Amino acid sequence: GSMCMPCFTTDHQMARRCDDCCGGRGRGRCYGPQCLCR
């Protein structure tokens, strides 16, 4: 699908994990329930 992985609001480190998914610092964004690589 579109997402690299999910983003869950209950996960306070969601933005860091999402970046990790997307290849490093500033590369992913949590947009609603999806981590999307920029």
Side-chain angles (χ1 to χ4, degrees), residues 1-15 17-24 26-38:
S2 40
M3 86 188 170
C4 194
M5 64 184 293
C7 291
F8 302 114
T9 63
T10 45
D11 182 6
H12 295 205
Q13 285 321 305
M14 64 176 186
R17 293 197 213 287
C18 173
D19 274 350
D20 192 0
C21 200
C22 290
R27 300 182 182 273
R29 64 167 197 139
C30 288
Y31 172 54
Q34 294 190 27
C35 169
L36 298 170
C37 302
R38 291 170 154 148

